[model samples]
Target chain A: GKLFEEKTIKTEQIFSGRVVKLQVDDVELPNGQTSKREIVRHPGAVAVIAITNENKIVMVEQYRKPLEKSIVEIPAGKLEKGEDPRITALRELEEETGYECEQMEWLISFATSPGFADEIIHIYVAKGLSKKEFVDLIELTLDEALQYIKEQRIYDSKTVIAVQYLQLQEALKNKLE
Target chain B: LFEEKTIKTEQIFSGRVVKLQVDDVELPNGQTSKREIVRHPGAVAVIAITNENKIVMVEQYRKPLEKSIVEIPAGKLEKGEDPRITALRELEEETGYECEQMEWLISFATSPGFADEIIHIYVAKGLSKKENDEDEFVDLIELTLDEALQYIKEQRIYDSKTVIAVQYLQLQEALKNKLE
Candidate 1:
């Protein structure tokens, strides 16, 4: 028993899917009581902010089976077993957006949903571009991405941070200038 | 086929909050693959600012995370419940502060690759206390923007909405001080 600590007493495996696993853990609460935690264990994933020199943001459109609709997001993919998020980010960018970057750097990583899922997505800002393209390839200006956010078309944490990243960069640049 | 065509779907166990399913589908390249999807009822998170401009937050244990973390007040939406109502209810229930109305800030899917959990975000100002004693043990606290930044740099404050909330506030500085 500690401050806000849930120790797993026993775990009941629920379902094992191709990529995501489901389980319910009978956890001992910090107050020394018991409760069940429905969890989704994922292999995690990564996305890349591939911005072109022409002030265009590279993205792709994919149909989300769960949402039953398509949304535009930065190039992203699920990580392979023990794969580095940096590698996943670059691979997704090249595979999905068809552009290879000269350098890739990790921007940030956060748990998408911590309540019942243990899925953390790593985001990278990629610079120096070369040719290529991937599914439903689309490019837009920063203004368009903001419009999409306001329009609810570009909706997701990664794509959102993608625009916010550019916004912050512009802000810092403006501040320096 | 990138818009995957689920040929056969196996409905898996449905839990109190999350549901599971496996979809055998054709990929965008016209190849077949199996995809696992998690379904949720969605949720709402609020960035509650006190009259002092302090951020209202809760430090609670997330069983899935197995550790305590600070998050802005949030809760899963009840069946057929309006998210606006859910936001205010969660704010009051968790922070014990009630607001007349919550202004919509943003709504986005959390894990789009595998899960369909969307978190609708709102902002609450002009706060007053209500009350609680429940299954959830919440330790409430308030943080100035500087203190919040320190928590984040120390990795003490680590969550999507929390980070986004801090960044959203940071943007105010960036957006406001835009010099000619």
Candidate 2:
């Protein structure tokens, strides 16, 4: 028996929107008790970690309505229903920052919040990046990048992952050299 | 100029863990729009790397995802609780590991599009065995960097916090090797 599995007895759809759908589930707990679970349904998303040939990481600053402030983050966008995540990554990278990459590699995927949301983010690493136009790309070195993240200036889950990836990649290269 | 300005907010649903609201906002182009938002109490996660470089992770069933996912030790903070303390408690409760040394890694917004859920990440070391949660149904698994990466591929680990933690551990090891 899966002790952690919650059996849904009933579900009531609360609100449907363009990005999020809210629902309440009456669940049968493993201890044979009942509880209410609020679930947010999402179509998932994709993010890109495009490192320029100059050893700088590319990021975009935009206003996040929920946080009511502008934050720096890697280029990302939501996936269209039934659409491939790789295409989404390519499209978002170009649309958000006007950059294109020569090679794209799938890095990893993870759920943003498994407790109440099903939003998973597919991450990709892009090399040989070329900027198409002046989109105010905030490029930073690994040390400066980590400083921003530590100070909560450049703060987002995907951005942190990308910066750490770059640091790790550089360390590995030095070891091989 | 920032694009979105809130006009009014309508309280939708307030649950134990999350609060939902719909805000009417004025777009930059003078158009009014509606934005749905979810507010959370925030959480803390820990990366407990052993002396052997094995990462401590926990496996539990997430009802929303309908799967048992392996993740780093983490928990939501109670009202007015310090995140550092929460991190220590979660590490002990989930993995039975207590750390004498702890450091704050980073804090991030999990879902900033529509939710205000932020998670503070920490790195803990000098691990020793401690008592775990007696009632919590969790399985502890320790893995090396390669095995942790493989675990993600196998879907045994599928949470963002855990993946980032594993990556951090890998980065730390690499940096240490370079210094050596």
Candidate 3:
């Protein structure tokens, strides 16, 4: 076992769907406590932080049933089974935004919800962007992005973190000068 | 990226908390993929700060992680409740702290790849003591910026909202201090 790892005794596949597998497991806690754990297993995903040549960020809108609305977010897609996140990042950028980048830099991997899901998101900063679009593309400057964030139009963790990342980067740059 | 057009949806499982479904989508490359998605109502978390600048938190056992991890006060949104309301309710019920105001920080989909569990994080200042939920058991914690950073490395404060809250606060503080 691992640190604070809940060891599984009996496992039941509660539901096997297309993107996720739900498991109801009988687990032994570290304190010798027995309990049932509901685990959601996913294939993980990649998000592309594509800033265009015009100094605007490339974002898209899509229907999210859970939120009951289509919200703006960075271009991202789920990884193909056993596919590298780097490759998925590129594929998602092209397929979702129609934009291709000559250079894509890996950012960091973030867990969306560690409380119940094992879904980790790999972020990439894509540059040298050209034309493309699979969905509705909305390019926003830093101020516009911040405003959208306040308006709750540009929602989601990856996008918020990406914006904050840019802010810190720029803040450091300005301070250096 | 081009939108992956949803062709059809196959509803699979309906549960007390979430609903699971599969979608057949046409990709940009003219191919198809079956997308498994878990649907959730969403949640809210608060970055409550005391007058002494300590971040209010709680130590709760997460069944999925199977460990007692320190995290910012958070709770799942109830039906018809605004996220701001949920944020205040969670801050009080979990930590017994009430705030004068709830400042919207950011809302992110916790598990966007497969699940739609969006967690709205807010910043609350001017905290005062209150009553906590009697049914739940959680250890209250307060950490300064330095201690919060240490907790991240120690893996005691490992989660989305908590990490984001720490980083966001750091950025704000960095901007204010202007370490030239």
Candidate 4:
């Protein structure tokens, strides 16, 4: 049941962080010999595509530290420690776009980097926003204050896998509908 | 003899995302090496979820693909930028949904054999709708999680992520019910 042809020759952590890190490894190939792999470690993240009453897509212009520029994007953010992607998706939707969920949906979750890094994304969908839904979202949800961890949704890879599934499903259904 | 194998080459193409071009060189094995390089502006794709746990998708006019294929909301990454942010922006712009809870999904270097286009895909949940109307240029679709997966199986949905995600869902549903 081993999916990969790897015999970990070595694992050295170059850097460490809450989500991602740097690593250097010497891995054996499927053919038997070994080679160097510059692997990146990541915790993963999620993205949401929401609809508005006017049917306009909600987006934001934010500065990207990595890209060093601002670009428009949907309401998205990273996952909390052991956070259920479903919950994380919902929370991110609200925080970034300020829409309240009359109903929230799970779409798909996927592995972000299967090749070099192991990162997964959990995706969600949101509906039902009250115009008066203006709360300092960032203040409401604190990283440290995870009130509900016991019934928490699954986090990361599987989460994004779910959302991606939903996106396609919806796309096909809409054509039929 | 392949010249001591000490020769190194650097070919960089500044496209939207990160892309490169490589040349053929003599390997240390005395054989000639040919590397077909690809220059890419990084890209990001996402499965945007709505508050109702439905998937958010777009139907836009694609000139190149010609026929409108239902694809995950995605965009080419800007130069040297984090694909994660690009994924988020494209979802919101094309779909009009936002999320309080987002998670990392998968990263794939699509078509590594030819194009060096690596994509970062994510899943968004815990969603909220913004106040304004979504742009009219893009058509939006909403599907229940299960139904969406079904379409993937039927091949009614024909994108890379759709096929992968849908199949994965069926497997999950089957497993979950098996326990029941």
Output the number of the lDDT-best candidate: 2
Question: Candidate 1 versus the native: TM-score?
Answer: 0.91
Q: For model 2, state the Cα shift of residue A158 in Å.
A: 0.9
Candidate 1 chain B has its poorest 10 consecutive residues by lDDT at B171-180
Write one digit per residue (lDDT tens) for candidate 4, span A14-93: 54533345466666655567665545445566767565565444544443222222333446677788877778877787
Encode model 2's per-residue lDDT on A1-177: one tens digit a residue.
143887899999988987889999998777778888899999888899988889888898867888887788888888788777888888888887777898888888889888889999999987898877535568888998988886787767878888888888888788777
Kindly state the fnat score of candidate 4: 0.00
Candidate 3 lDDT score at position A38: 71
In order, the candidates keep a fraction of the true contacts of 0.62, 0.66, 0.36, 0.00
Models ranked on DockQ = 2, 1, 3, 4
Q: Report the error of model 3 at residue A27, Å.
A: 2.8
Give the runs in model 2 whose Cα sits over 4 Å from its true position: A1-3, A133-136, B1-3, B131-136
Give the top-scoring candidate (DockQ): 2
Any residue pairs clashing in model 2, and if so which? Answer: none
Interface RMSD of 3: 3.8
Query: What does the lDDT read for residue B122 in candidate 4?
Result: 78
Q: What is the C-alpha RMSD of each candidate to the true structure, in Å?
A: 2.6, 2.3, 4.5, 19.6
lDDT of 2 at A156: 72
